Amino acid sequence: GPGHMSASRDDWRAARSMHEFSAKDIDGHMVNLDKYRGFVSIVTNVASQCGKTEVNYTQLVDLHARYAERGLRILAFPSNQFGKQEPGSNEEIKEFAAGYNVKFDMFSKIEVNGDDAHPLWKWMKIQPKGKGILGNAIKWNFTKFLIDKNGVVVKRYGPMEEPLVIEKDLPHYF
């Protein structure tokens, strides 16, 4: 018969990267996370009212610009499920990033916790770098997943860690 390959993508065994998922940008248009194939990529949740917001962003922009020559990318997911982290309208969170000189796109309309969490973040939470010992779940906003250029989660950093912690493992992959 016609065709040589087909798949029903039944569960996590078919999911191999962010490339098997897609998320809205802050304007509401679909981002194809497939575009991260061949790029060293980072996945983290952002917020305007964290105790460390500028302590993250002021490094985050510099690292993006410093490795822009090598193909470094970072998809920033604004998030409120932890507490009082992000109570603004999405149109604030768009220009909030521009206040730190951000040249990467701002993202919107995902979830990271509960049964209706966006499946990108479920796939990372079920990865061996995102899983806990007991009940799982992200500790706080600004939790950082590290993806080598092949789209596979290599590493993960706690929400107290700066992007400057990633800057140590970054140059080994490119």
Expressed as residue numbers, the domain containing 63 is 18-173
Kindly state whether residue 128 falls inside one of the protein's structural domains.
Answer: yes
Residue 53: which CATH number? Answer: 3.40.30.10
**What is the C-alpha to C-alpha distance for residues 11 and 67, in angstroms, rounded to an integer?**
34
Residue 22, judged by CB atoms within 10 A of its CB (0-12, 13-18, 19+), counts as middle
Strand order in the sheet with 144-147: 72-78, 40-46, 144-147, 153-157
With b for 16 or more beta-carbon neighbours within 10 A and e for fewer, the 58-82 pattern comes to: ebbbebbeebeeeebbbbbbbbbeb
Kindly state whether residue 4 falls inside one of the protein's structural domains.
Answer: no
Residue at 32: amino acid letter: N
Per DSSP bridges, beta strands 107-108 and 72-78 are: unpaired
Kindly state whether residue 5 falls inside one of the protein's structural domains.
Answer: no
169 backbone φψ class: left, alpha, beta (φ>0; ψ -120 to 50): alpha
DSSP state of 104: S
Kindly state whether residue 7 falls inside one of the protein's structural domains.
Answer: no
| Number of domains into which the chain is organized | 1
